[PDB]
Amino acid sequence: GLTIGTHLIPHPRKAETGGEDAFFVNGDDGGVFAVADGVSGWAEKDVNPALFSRELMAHTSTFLKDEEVNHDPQLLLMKAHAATTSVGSATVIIAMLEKTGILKIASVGDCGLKVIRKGQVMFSTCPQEHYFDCPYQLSSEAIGQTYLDALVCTVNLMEGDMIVSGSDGFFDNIFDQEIVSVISESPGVDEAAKALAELARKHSVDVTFDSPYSMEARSRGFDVPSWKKFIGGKLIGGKMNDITVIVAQVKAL
Amino acid sequence: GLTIGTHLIPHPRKAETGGEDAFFVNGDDGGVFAVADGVSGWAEKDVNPALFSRELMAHTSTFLKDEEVNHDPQLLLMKAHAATTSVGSATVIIAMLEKTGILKIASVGDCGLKVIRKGQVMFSTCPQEHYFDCPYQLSSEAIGQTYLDALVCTVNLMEGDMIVSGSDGFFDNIFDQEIVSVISESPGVDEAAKALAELARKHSVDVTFDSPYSMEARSRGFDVPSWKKFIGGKLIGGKMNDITVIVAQVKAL
Ligand SMILES: C[C@H](CO)OC[C@@H](C)OC[C@@H](C)OC[C@@H](C)OC[C@@H](C)OC[C@H](C)OC[C@@H](C)O
Ligand SMILES: C[C@H](CO)OC[C@@H](C)OC[C@@H](C)OC[C@@H](C)OC[C@@H](C)OC[C@H](C)OC[C@@H](C)O
Ligand SMILES: [Mg+2]
Ligand SMILES: [Mg+2]
Ligand SMILES: [Mg+2]
Ligand SMILES: [Mg+2]
Ligand SMILES: [Mg+2]
Ligand SMILES: [Mg+2]
Ligand SMILES: [Mn+2]
Ligand SMILES: [Mn+2]
């Protein structure tokens, strides 16, 4: 099973309506969770990006009671996506722990999941994108991706392992060593999820912080010329974004 | 199945004996390969540093004919390790493709495996270490790790996926985008394995190349004045090492 804690911090400008990230958690049995990040660009269509991600999570809850798909995260995505009628799009990850400790994962886009064991990250999902900051995404539009495009994987867990999952707003704004440090000094999953989300939030609004996002952008060629890299002029900064964090401790295998 | 190509370049000062990396490949059925990196430093014990990795690979091939373990990389490691009598130690990875396209992996230490799909890395193993450059390792000595310490995972593959695996001598000396670039311009697995190994080799002997190894060391704090003064200068350049590259293309699922 999993002991699961969660925290969400919307982008400051979108806080009034709850942001556009959505999630699902059920820790009653083996342990299951999901995160969906509604894609920011939809406001330009006079479309609320939160409807699609929220509906995707609602249908995930329903299809978890469908015995033909409820042990296969990729097939859960298939059914939840097909049932979603709201206009919009989202990145999404679903993870479920079997009683044997096998964690099954399906991911479309740039949500993420890491496993921390014995003080280090030993498993980390890779984001999918068409180009920088344009993720694979499930959509109301034919141009989007489908369950066939999901990254589908598993990892065998052991008691005491810590799973950390969330949206790109989290991972773009926090380094692996910070995740490990915060986890180590938190007394429980609820406190860990809040402290992790708050640290990412602090970084996300800090224009002076060299975030994973800004480092990654410089690696792609978005950098300024090397002769213009004075202090005050570098391509650095957190990435303001909705932040969703799920922290899950493996128990009773 | 897998179409598999390989290329090995020993450390320039260990070429006469072939270095201390070892590997096994079998592309005749569903596809399986393994890499073991004998740990540098056993030569200080006056121990033949290549014997443990070579023997571990030999026993891996034998236990691939043991029906009790031959569909479980972690159990293959268990048997191969227990059968190895040579003094020494090694990091190791075993990967096995089922006919469904499920790639099963078990890894101890800092060998690595990446999956490249549609022009990007979509899966990447995480190295295990006790501290910087001191990896988890299977050993002749009680202080080493066992199969219970392996990271065990799977990833679902599709036709055309490219698997790139190898020892730390490869991954410490090449960036993911170089791997993707070389794979993109290679007409076959043999050509990719040789081009990848040769590029890593060129980097490994280049004091001017800011290698993944040297960047990682700086991110740990070995560039601070106390550690820089202790080692005698900045930690820079490629990392000289045995280089092993396996490239496998997914076919006929
Ligand atoms: C993934 C790919 C990248 O290759 O692109 C991502 C894309 C999904 O995100 C772009 C999005 C922010 O803009 C949506 C845009 C495509 O509008 C759709 C339009 C054609 O619908 C017409 C029609 C009147 O709509 C009626 C309304 C009721 O739905
Ligand atoms: C058999 C002989 C016969 O005389 O008995 C002598 C015995 C004392 O063996 C010598 C041994 C100490 O040499 C091992 C060393 C050369 O390699 C270091 C590595 C194996 O340990 C790292 C290990 C995982 O990590 C350690 C720490 C980071 O947790
Ligand atoms: Mg969003
Ligand atoms: Mg991104
Ligand atoms: Mg995003
Ligand atoms: Mg070695
Ligand atoms: Mg290393
Ligand atoms: Mg090494
Ligand atoms: Mn986001
Ligand atoms: Mn090596």
Side-chain angles (χ1 to χ4, degrees), chain B residues 97-148:
Chain B
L97 188 72
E98 304 288 355
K99 287 315 226 280
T100 166
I102 298 172
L103 187 72
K104 300 174 183 175
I105 304 164
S107 182
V108 176
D110 58 11
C111 288
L113 184 151
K114 290 166 198 288
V115 179
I116 294 159
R117 173 181 304 159
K118 300 187 177 186
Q120 61 201 287
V121 178
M122 287 208 186
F123 186 89
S124 183
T125 58
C126 299
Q128 304 167 313
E129 47 179 31
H130 302 288
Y131 52 88
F132 180 75
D133 216 24
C134 176
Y136 280 24
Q137 52 196 265
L138 305 185
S139 186
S140 59
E141 311 306 309
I143 199 162
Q145 283 56 73
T146 75
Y147 74 104
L148 292 174

Side-chain angles (χ1 to χ4, degrees), chain A residues 20 37-56 59 80-90 137-143:
Chain A
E20 297 146 7
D37 175 349
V39 175
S40 283
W42 285 92
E44 272 315 281
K45 191 176 180 56
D46 297 320
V47 170
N48 175 6
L51 291 184
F52 186 96
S53 56
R54 285 173 191 165
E55 180 176 2
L56 189 66
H59 296 317
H81 184 195
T84 296
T85 59
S86 295
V87 175
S89 69
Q137 52 196 267
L138 304 183
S139 180
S140 61
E141 306 312 298
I143 199 170

Side-chain angles (χ1 to χ4, degrees), chain A residues 212-224:
Chain A
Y213 179 89
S214 59
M215 291 185 179
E216 179 185 1
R218 295 197 305 279
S219 82
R220 309 283 194 100
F222 293 84
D223 211 346
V224 306

Side-chain angles (χ1 to χ4, degrees), chain B residues 14 42-43 50 87 97 115 132 149 174-175 183 187 194 199 225 252:
Chain B
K14 311 185 311 212
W42 282 97
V87 173
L97 188 72
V115 179
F132 180 75
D149 302 305
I174 196 168
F175 289 94
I183 286 285
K194 186 177 187 181
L199 179 58

Side-chain angles (χ1 to χ4, degrees), chain A residues 237-251:
Chain A
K239 184 205 85 161
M240 288 181 63
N241 215 238
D242 295 322
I243 292 161
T244 298
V245 176
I246 302 189
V247 173
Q249 172 177 51
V250 177
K251 68 179 168 194

